[PDB]
Amino acid sequence: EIQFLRTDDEVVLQCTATIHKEQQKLCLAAEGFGNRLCFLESTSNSKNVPPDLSICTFVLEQSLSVRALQEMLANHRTLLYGHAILLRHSYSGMYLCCLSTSRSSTDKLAFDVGLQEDTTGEACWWTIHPASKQRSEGEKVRVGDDLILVSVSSERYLHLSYGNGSLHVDAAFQQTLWSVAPISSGSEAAQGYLIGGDVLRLLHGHMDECLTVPSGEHGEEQRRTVHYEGGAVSVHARSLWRLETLRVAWSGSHIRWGQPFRLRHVTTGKYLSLMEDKNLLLMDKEKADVKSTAFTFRSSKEKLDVGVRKEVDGMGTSEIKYGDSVCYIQHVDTGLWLTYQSVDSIQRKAIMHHEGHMDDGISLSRSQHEESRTARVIRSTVFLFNRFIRGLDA
Amino acid sequence: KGEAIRIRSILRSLIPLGDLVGVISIAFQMPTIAKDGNVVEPDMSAGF
C-alpha cells in the first residue's frame, strides 16, 4: 500500500541540479538565526560529505482549501493536490515564505525565499500543484510523486536558478520540479526509543562519566580529542551528540541494532572518526568519509551474527530504548570496540580496541529540544564571531 | 481587493518608474523650414 504524505510528518524538499551533465540532488536549507535566506546543500555526496538534514527538514502544519484560506485570511486530514501547505522549519520553528525583497541577481520579477516568524499573510502559505499529468487536483499526494510549488502571495514558482554562479533558490515564474522525501512521522514515533536525528548523551555503565571532548580553551586542535568525564559535564553542552543515519529518506525512523550511523558533536560540529593509529579523533565536515565516521550499535559485546537486513521505508521496530537498553558501539569496518584506557574529572581517554573491556556498556539519554537548540545556536555563533574576529585581526 | 493590489504591484515590478520618466523625457525632432522655403518633413514612420 503506497504511503501518502501528511501533516505532522517531517519531510525534506529535494530538487535536482544538472552540473557537468550530472544530476545532484539538493535539499532546501535555511539556518534559523543569522541568515534568513534559504540555500541548498548537497545530498548526493553523502558518502564523502555528510548532509546536514537538520536544516533541510520541514514540518507540514496545515493543508487548507483555497476558499477556506481566503476566508480565514479575510477574517490529521489527507493532502490533496490543489491545497496550500504551511511548511514550518523544524529546527528554527519559522515558516517558509517569499521575503518580498529581491537580490535581483537575474531579473527584477523573482523574489527571495526565506523564513518568517509570523504566519499571517499570504507569503507563508504555498499552494501544492501536481507536476505530473498522472495527477489531478484533489488526488492524494504520493510519496514518490514530484511536485511544483506556487506561492500564494507572489504567485511565483519555487525555482532553482542556474543563472547565478552558485545554485540558488528563488521565487520565479519559471517552474522547477521538487521531490519531497519523508524523514519521519510523528504519530508512529514511540516514546522512550532512539530514532534517527536525535541529540543524545553517551553515558557509561555507572551513569557517572559521559563521552565528551576537552573543555574549551579556544583551540579546536586540542578540542578534537574525545574522552570520558563526569560531574557537570553530563549537564553541560560538550557531551551532546547527534546520531545521523546514512540514508536521506526515512532518516528519522527508529534506530535498529547494527545500523550504520555517524556521530556529530553538536557544539564543535566535527564528526567522530577513527585514525590509522586506532585512536579516535574529531575531523571536519568536508573530509568526513563514511569509511572513517560510521559506527553501529550492537546488543551484546560478543560477536553475534549481526547480519544484513534490507532497509525498509518506514519507522520500523523500536529495538533501542533510552536508558533501559545497553548498547555496544563499534566501527563498521575495523570492528574494534570503543573502550577506556583502563588507566584513569576522571579524564580517561577512549580507545578503539579489538576485544575490548568487559565494562564497555554505554546507555542512551535523550536531550531536550531547548538544550539541543542552545548548543546549535552556540556553534552557529562561535563560527560567525570567530570569522568576525579574524577579519578584524587581518 | 487583494488580487487588484497584487496585479498592480506586479505591474510596477515589470516597469520601473524611472524608465517611464526617462522615455517621457526623450524629446522629438521637429520639422524646420529649409533654405529654399520648404519645411523639411521628417517621416514619422521612421522616427519617434
Added chain:
Amino acid sequence: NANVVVRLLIRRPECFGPALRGEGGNGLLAAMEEAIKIAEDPSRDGPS
C-alpha cells in the same frame, strides 16, 4: 480578461521583448534610445 493575460505573459516572460525579458536586458529606456539609434542608422533600419 486582464488577470488571465497578465498571468500568461508573466508565466512566459519572453513575450516582453529582449529588453524587459530580464536575463540581462538593458531596460525599457535603454532599448528606447537603442531603437532611436537604429532609426537613424540606415543599415540597421532598412534591408539594404
